[PDB]
Design a binder for this molecule. Structure first.
Ligand SMILES: CCC1=C(C)/C(=C/C2=NC(=C\c3[nH]c(/C=C4\NC(=O)[C@H](C)[C@H]4CC)c(C)c3CCC(=O)O)/C(CCC(=O)O)=C2C)NC1=O
Ligand SMILES: CCC1=C(C)/C(=C/C2=NC(=C\c3[nH]c(/C=C4\NC(=O)[C@H](C)[C@H]4CC)c(C)c3CCC(=O)O)/C(CCC(=O)O)=C2C)NC1=O
Ligand SMILES: CCC1=C(C)/C(=C/C2=NC(=C\c3[nH]c(/C=C4\NC(=O)[C@H](C)[C@H]4CC)c(C)c3CCC(=O)O)/C(CCC(=O)O)=C2C)NC1=O
Ligand SMILES: CCC1=C(C)/C(=C/C2=NC(=C\c3[nH]c(/C=C4\NC(=O)[C@H](C)[C@H]4CC)c(C)c3CCC(=O)O)/C(CCC(=O)O)=C2C)NC1=O
Ligand SMILES: CCC1=C(C)/C(=C/C2=NC(=C\c3[nH]c(/C=C4\NC(=O)[C@H](C)[C@H]4CC)c(C)c3CCC(=O)O)/C(CCC(=O)O)=C2C)NC1=O
Ligand SMILES: CCC1=C(C)/C(=C/C2=NC(=C\c3[nH]c(/C=C4\NC(=O)[C@H](C)[C@H]4CC)c(C)c3CCC(=O)O)/C(CCC(=O)O)=C2C)NC1=O
Ligand SMILES: CCC1=C(C)/C(=C/C2=NC(=C\c3[nH]c(/C=C4\NC(=O)[C@H](C)[C@H]4CC)c(C)c3CCC(=O)O)/C(CCC(=O)O)=C2C)NC1=O
Lengths: 160, 92, 161, 173, 160, 161, 160, 161, 161, 160, 161
């Protein structure tokens, strides 16, 4: 969490957390209930978000599901949708601990190597996370969209 | 000369690890530990054996153990192999 | 290291689950006590030297271990042990802020008993000094923060014994 | 580096005096634009790849000699794929550090982490300095096309790129 | 400054500021107005703060002004009050910066060496700072006094 | 490291002997197969990434170890394990060129089981991935070179078990 | 010990003791008898040395025994005289060893940390050691007092 | 570094000569003053902190350089300059023991003016602080040792100017 | 390391005692033999190479261990073993000068048997070579110094066996 | 020089000379007079020392002056005697310095490389130095010869 | 400056020697090539402007350094750089006539890199322009004189790099 980051940067210098870091922790801990409801909202609508983002991603890249693509076939498409679900779950974790650490430890670091290993193009992955952000913002509030967008953009930058 | 010459908070020298080792100490530990790199997957450097058994000087064992704990490593065994125990003069 | 939030997120992520009502329960529990935790951490940072001084004075200052032959006789050994007590207090404060003793396992207790046994440091006297420090710290921070801090003090003492 | 608050506080510490209403007005000036500075930072983080692709294309359309053989003069331009990747990396560098500078309200991060030693490196590598500034102000225009009528954001965007352009330049006049 | 420290901590890792750091910068620029108000109140009541802190110090530590003490005589007492004024000014700087960087970079790094070279007992300076802290927190509200003593406590911890 | 030639020379030198008819027998045996060894090493260098990809796809790509809770779940762990498989393939190629598995003992197997046990890496899944890599490699290089490569693949698997 | 230090300094270089080091060991073992005599004289006059040094300290530093001072009260004064006796014993050890290794390994390494943790002013300990030095050198001959104060001076320098 | 003995031996060796009567003259001269040199070095080691404190108090303690704007205003700068004065005193003591200022050339004066000019440290105030330290040091060690120490103090001041 | 003086001072200091008549007895005993110790150390430093050469010639040179199959057959092994014998002689000289075998425990015998067992070095032949070196060394330094040196030679042999 | 070496060994540790090092410097400056006397005796008897050492060498090693040997002929024999004179001069330097620093810095560092590049057997030089050692120690007293051979032995050890 | 004759005379005079057979060898060597040197110097004096023009045209005339932002963009900078190239050609001719590059050290290379670094002049482009001038000059004067001139051209380029 942010608490962990503050503690780690304070421990690496062999000191107690300064005043500014302590108020970082304070302000974050006062934000807890808002995030703890927002992930309620987003977990409520996952089955819809994934369903629409999936049709978007293949309207943009129809050759992925065409004969010869990486996702052509029932088994492959099911697992792309599963990847959608996993990334939405990671985004809920990231919104909970109010910074990028789950999205980085799981997800971003080493992801290009895994996808090059599997045969999924990386530009398709970037566009899929874009379509996911699209689908999620289409079904939530404007204040909630304001709160959730930077987490998607961090993923988009961490893949590229 | 030695690490415990009065330096603490508010010194000119930055805050750091302070060994209690008497100057020119000759006490030595024998330690076994594992230390995964946890940075190789974005620097892309070649691998190295992370399982180590070595002798470390008493004057550097504390900073060494704290560095090992910083980077996620696990310490499997420690042994003082050189030097007495609770010897007042004669650690040099 | 993982705090309470990291532990909840890990428990949820290791099952492919979204954060359900029990995770929200634990997260609210941590968020309600965070401000008390920050207050206690500030107060402890304020008075670390006096806490260590008073604990040493009440626990082992006039015993036989500080006399010739004792573990902490010479000035080197006295300074080393007060530095050790400072370590224990600082890491207990970290654990109290995080709400999770994993930092104590990773950075303090890992290979500590073996180091003390190789050096000849008495474990019982160390545990008693930590217990005396627990008294002064709970005293200074009040009942709730003192129970929180005593949790991690007792964690260190159990890992050392 | 120093943000604007740190530099004002350092100017007041230099004479050993407390903050008066002038320095406090200077600090209020930053506190009143901070939120739109953060909006600009978030926009830049959302559009970084596309902004740099557009900037590189617009640079190479009007400086086509940058993509051709170096000429015997062993000039470091974007000739091959190796040099091309290095140049795009530099463009990302400039974007990142001027985003930092926009958030700080100051240009000290720029001359400490970008400008100090830049011309020595480019001269030793023989990298073109004219087109390098050209692409920086191209990036500036592309960013400014997102906030046009809001003039205050226009100047806030113009600050870092124009600092970089005037400091990488030589003084012909 | 909080902005500066966030920028350096993000610079070492070669990454842009994550949405958590930007969130915290935003919260800081939003609170800058009450920060300036609190700095106002502490700044323009400096005479009473230094005077009443000097009293509480001299009543708690009569040896420093006793015959021969470090601050013995008119000039030495004036110099000690000068030092207390220095530290009050640094506390105002830290309050407006949102972090103890101004206090620590000016007046805390190497303070033990300086006061040992001058022959001044550092515990007396700590006592003076604590007395000034009580006097200054007496003039603020509850939350304001809590946030203002946050820096006096750091200055005391660094000056042990 | 010592290859076949180095091993023969060492066996002869450790007795103060000149290279007699049996040493000539072994040396001719190595010299006859050297060209096939070079061909196989070139072909394996050509297709290392595809070999590793196909072995991972046939051995552990869709099993439960790649799901949450499994060893290689996160992206860090996936990348680390594919790097490990690349290590195994490269060192097996070195051993095949040298005609002697001593490089595997000195540079690979020394302290590998202990590292995997401390990390928690499943040994059986690793051995099965190496076995799948043996299939693809023998497939790509043909029967004789595949038996040669499988010798050192099985050497690694036996040293790991 | 001189022999020990010569042996380590020769051991690091992986060589036998050169004829200079052996010369110096020889000169040391030849002077060992007057070293033991001087240690005798200092050792068995310990009561007067500690008493008269404590007097000169308390007259030079009345604050430490003033009401509230660190050595205020019967028990604290006894403890301070105990410390002075400790340092006199260490000086005798150093005199017989021919080098400040015994004094420095016992009582000098980390002395500032200890006395700061105890709340004792280190300058008072330095004053006490200087007073004991004058008292002890008063009882020796010219050359003997010169050689004996050689160690008190080192103890004072380390205790600044 | 070379002391008086090393310098005499070098002057004799650079000509293929044996140590003749003039070398014996210089060597006797050094050997006669060695004991006074040891006495002075011991006394200076005894009172280094007080010497630096008194020199700073008499030279630049209440001037305008210690006020805001001055070159040693903040606590960092004050500590740095007292550390510099400690360096100067220690190296002057080394030079006095050796009877040769070559250590000052090799370890102190080499690139010192350039460092001070890049930092903005006032050279005149530094030379005056060293002159004040010369007064106190000669005062404490007596006339002959004070002249010996003042030789190297003036050497440092000339190399700095 | 601790010599005789350090050991006496430690025994007295570990009890809070002043050096009484028995400590004076031991200290006088060491001071009386110091000059003989210095003489022996000088003579041994003079003739180390010849001592090692003669011990090797009388103990193990034209035997089966120097022939093919023997430990020190090759030139690497011969050089390594003569270096080992030089180590033993130098450390025995240190121990004789100090009058205390603690340096042998700290710098020589700690983990030596385990190293020799891992390398395959024969322990009996090593002990025999050290015994032959004891003969030559006592021969060269005379009876009393030879008894002194043989004390530490036998200490090394007992720690090795 | 002993003073120089003590100063460097104390300089690396960033400390003044301890009383042991000062004791040893004192003992050295006190013995400087007999050091100069011994250097006198060795210095001004150089012709006999070189001549008689050359004889003992040529009788012990007839191959070096045999037909074709390295020192074969008038000029080569003169050059070898020149080398022996070089080393006697260095031994006198070392005697007056109180330590083998002059001998080792001039004539020992890289001596094997030089004599291998010249084609000279280093064992012959060692034999010549040993013969000169016996001849020179024959002209001194017991303790003087012991102290003087102390350096010939070091030169022989370095020249193995 | 010293030419070949001056250098030979200096080498002979610095030893108190008369000019022996080796000095005569070098002197004859210079005297044999002097006439070719004079021919080349005349031809180079004839065509200096065309040589510089052609070198600039082949090396940096149409590159990006002559465009806005480049080094030699404005007319001042273009004129300054062609003057620099004229300097280099004239001094290389002097060095070729003298048979000794000491004039280049004394009058050209002394402090040139520092001046160019303070001004911001690109060193690589300058070295390449000098290399292009070497081509044209060797072209115009023929093979032997071109090698002679290229010696000093490469000397300037090495002193500049
Ligand atoms: C961050 C977790 C952590 C701890 C706690 C730690 C302890 C640690 N304590 C040490 C020594 C020591 N520790 C003590 C402590 C004590 N003596 C007593 O009598 C008391 C019971 C006790 C204090 C309460 C003493 C006296 C020594 C010195 C041992 C010696 O000099 O021989 C040393 C040897 C290093 C040195 O001083 O040179 C280490 C590494 N290291 C770590 O990484
Ligand atoms: C040259 C010989 C050699 C090898 C082989 C080697 C392995 C090695 N594998 C490691 C980790 C690892 N190795 C794996 C491998 C696997 N996970 C699975 O489920 C599979 C069965 C298996 C791949 C087939 C994983 C997942 C990690 C990461 C452990 C972690 O991050 O906790 C690490 C820890 C270093 C780090 O990544 O920071 C080392 C040192 N080192 C060597 O020197
Ligand atoms: C010698 C090794 C080597 C190659 C080949 C290379 C190519 C290369 N091709 C480029 C662009 C381009 N290349 C192509 C087209 C193609 N490219 C092809 O190899 C196909 C024949 C064709 C597609 C059918 C196009 C259309 C662009 C414009 C870039 C864009 O706007 O996307 C660029 C960017 C600059 C430019 O526009 O010229 C490089 C550096 N660099 C190298 O160092
Ligand atoms: C949390 C970080 C993380 C990720 C991302 C992850 C992915 C992952 N993706 C898989 C498959 C897959 N995933 C895809 C994905 C896609 N195809 C496309 O065209 C799209 C761009 C994309 C969907 C958005 C495909 C095509 C496969 C199967 C390819 C194959 O069959 O080899 C599998 C094997 C499933 C199983 O073993 O039961 C895993 C574990 N694991 C992780 O731990
Ligand atoms: C052998 C090296 C060595 C030293 C020096 C040493 C000192 C030492 N001094 C102590 C206390 C003390 N020391 C003093 C000393 C002083 N008060 C003053 O004002 C004066 C400046 C100074 C006397 C000159 C006092 C007052 C205490 C008791 C502090 C307290 O209990 O509050 C204590 C705690 C109680 C005890 O004596 O056991 C130790 C361990 N221990 C060692 O092993
Ligand atoms: C901005 C950070 C900063 C600080 C704090 C600072 C302190 C500082 N304190 C000084 C003196 C002094 N300071 C004191 C202070 C005290 N006496 C006591 O007994 C009390 C414990 C204490 C007052 C609370 C005294 C008495 C002197 C004069 C000492 C002397 O001249 O002998 C001096 C030398 C004269 C001068 O004021 O210019 C400096 C530079 N400089 C800085 O740049
Ligand atoms: C200071 C205390 C100390 C000792 C003694 C020591 C010994 C030591 N002896 C070694 C080898 C060796 N030691 C010997 C010695 C012998 N062979 C025989 O047959 C004889 C019985 C015996 C000599 C008397 C040989 C032959 C080797 C080489 C082993 C090999 O190359 O495989 C090695 C391996 C290092 C290397 O050479 O690369 C060490 C570390 N290390 C120490 O720190």
């Amino acid at each position: 969490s942010l608490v962990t980051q503050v503690i780690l940067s304070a421990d690496d210098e062999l000191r107690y957390p300064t005043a500014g870091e302590l108020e970082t922790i304070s302000s974050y801990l006062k934000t807890g209930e808002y995030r703890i409801r927002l992930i309620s909202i987003l977990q409520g609508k996952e089955q819809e978000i994934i369903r629409l983002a999936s049709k978007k991603i293949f309207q943009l890249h129809p050759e992925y599901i065409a004969p010869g693509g990486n996702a052509s076939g029932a088994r492959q498409r099911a697992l792309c949708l599963r990847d959608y679900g996993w990334y939405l779950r990671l985004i809920t974790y990231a919104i909970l601990a109010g910074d990028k650490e789950p999205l980085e430890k799981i997800g971003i670091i080493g992801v290009r190597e895994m996808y090059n290993s599997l045969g999924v193009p990386i530009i398709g992955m970037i566009d899929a996370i874009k379509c996911l952000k699209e689908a999620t913002v289409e079904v939530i509030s404007q204040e909630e969209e304001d709160f959730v967008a930077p987490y998607y953009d961090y993923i988009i930058q961490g893949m590229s | 000369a030695y690490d415990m010459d009065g330096t603490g908070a508010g010194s000119l020298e930055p805050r750091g690890i302070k060994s209690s080792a008497v100057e020119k100490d000759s006490r030595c530990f024998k330690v076994t530990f594992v230390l995964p790199s946890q940075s190789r997957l974005y620097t892309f450097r070649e691998l190295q054996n992370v399982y180590t058994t070595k002798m470390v000087p008493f004057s550097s064992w504390y900073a060494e153990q704290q560095r090992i704990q910083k980077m996620g490593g696990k310490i499997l065994k420690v042994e003082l192999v050189a030097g007495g125990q609770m010897r007042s003069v004669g650690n040099q | 290291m993982q705090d309470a939030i990291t532990s909840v997120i890990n428990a949820a992520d290791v099952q492919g689950k979204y954060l359900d009502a029990n995770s929200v329960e634990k997260l609210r529990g941590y968020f309600q006590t965070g401000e008390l935790r920050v207050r206690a951490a500030a107060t402890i940072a304020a008075n670390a030297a006096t806490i260590i001084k008073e604990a040493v004075a009440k626990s082992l200052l006039y015993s036989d271990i500080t006399r010739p032959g004792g573990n902490m006789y010479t000035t080197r050994r006295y300074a080393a042990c007060i530095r050790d007590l400072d370590y224990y207090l600082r890491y207990a404060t970290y654990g109290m802020l995080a709400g999770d003793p994993s930092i104590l396992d990773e950075r303090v207790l890992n290979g500590l008993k073996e180091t003390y046994n190789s050096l000849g440091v008495p474990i019982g006297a160390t545990i008693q000094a930590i217990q005396a420090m627990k008294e002064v710290t709970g005293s200074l921070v009040g009942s709730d923060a003192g129970k929180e801090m005593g949790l991690y003090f007792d964690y260190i003492c159990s890992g050392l014994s | 580096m120093q943000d604007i608050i740190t530099s004002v506080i350092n100017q007041y510490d230099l004479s050993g005096r407390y903050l008066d209403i002038k320095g406090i007005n200077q600090i209020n000036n930053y506190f009143d634009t901070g939120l739109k500075r953060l909006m600009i930072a978030k926009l830049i983080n959302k559009e970084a790849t596309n902004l740099i692709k557009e900037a590189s294309e617009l640079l190479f359309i009007e400086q086509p000699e940058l993509l051709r053989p170096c000429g015997n003069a062993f000039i470091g331009n974007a000739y091959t794929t190796r040099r091309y990747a290095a140049c795009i990396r530099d463009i990302e560098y400039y974007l990142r550090y001027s985003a930092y500078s926009i958030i700080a309200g100051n240009n000290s991060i720029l001359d400490e982490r970008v400008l100090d030693g830049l011309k020595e490196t480019y001269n030793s590598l023989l990298v073109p300095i004219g087109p390098t500034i050209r692409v920086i102000q191209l990036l500036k225009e592309i960013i400014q096309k997102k906030f046009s009528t809001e003039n205050i954001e226009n100047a806030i965007i113009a600050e870092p790129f124009d600092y970089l352009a005037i400091n990488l330049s030589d003084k012909n006049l | 400054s909080i902005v500066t420290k966030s920028i350096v901590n993000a610079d070492a890792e070669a990454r842009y500021l994550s949405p958590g750091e930007l969130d915290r910068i935003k919260s800081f620029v939003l609170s800058g107005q009450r920060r300036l108000r609190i700095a106002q109140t502490l700044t323009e009541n400096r005479e009473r703060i230094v005077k009443q802190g000097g009293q509480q110090l001299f009543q708690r530590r009569p040896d420093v002004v006793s015959p021969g003490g470090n601050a013995y005589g008119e000039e030495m007492t004036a110099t000690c009050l000068r030092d207390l004024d220095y530290y009050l000014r640094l506390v105002t700087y830290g309050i407006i910066a949102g972090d103890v960087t101004p206090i620590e970079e000016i007046g805390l790094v190497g303070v033990k060496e300086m006061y040992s070279a001058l022959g001044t007992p550092i515990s007396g300076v700590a006592e003076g700072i604590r007395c000034m802290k009580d006097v200054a927190c007496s003039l603020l509200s509850g939350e304001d006094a809590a946030e203002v003593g946050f820096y006096f406590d750091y200055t005391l911890a660094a000056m042990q």
